[PDB]
Design a protein around this ligand. Structure first.
Ligand SMILES: [Cl-]
Ligand SMILES: [Cl-]
Ligand code: NA
Length: 129
């Protein structure tokens, strides 16, 4: 599923991400835009052989099991395919663990390079929330 901007904002708000660990809603929408272009089915392979999955491009090296990343962890206790669903629940629940692990949203390279320090509230402007 390819979300609209305000559609995804409302879904993320109704999963508890607004100001989660101090990150306002616009931060999450901005991250999803540049990680996946709002597409739940996005996948990308990394040089080390791990793969990033879903709307927030969660990495199989640490967070989910895809059966082909030897020596990796599954800290969110889920198959990586669950992160590609049109229902964003699994992605949101796993993102909450990632952002709580000490490094905040710097875990998402696109957030650090394209959202951090910008007017992220622009990403939810005009949306009814
Ligand atoms: Cl915001
Ligand atoms: Cl933080
Ligand atoms: Na894994």
């Amino acid at each position: 599923k390819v979300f609209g901007r305000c559609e995804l904002a409302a879904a993320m708000k109704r999963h508890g991400l607004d100001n989660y660990r101090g990150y306002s809603l616009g931060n999450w929408v901005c991250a999803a835009k540049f990680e996946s272009n709002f597409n739940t089915q996005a996948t990308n392979r990394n040089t080390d052989g791990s793969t990033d999955y879903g709307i927030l491009q969660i990495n199989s090296r640490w967070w989910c099991n895809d059966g082909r990343t030897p020596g990796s962890r599954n800290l969110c206790n889920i198959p990586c395919s669950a992160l590609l669903s049109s229902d964003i629940t699994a992605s949101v629940n796993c993102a909450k663990k990632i952002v709580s692990d000490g490094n905040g949203m710097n875990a998402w390279v696109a957030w650090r390079n394209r959202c951090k320090g910008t007017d992220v509230q622009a990403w939810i402007r005009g949306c009814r929330l």
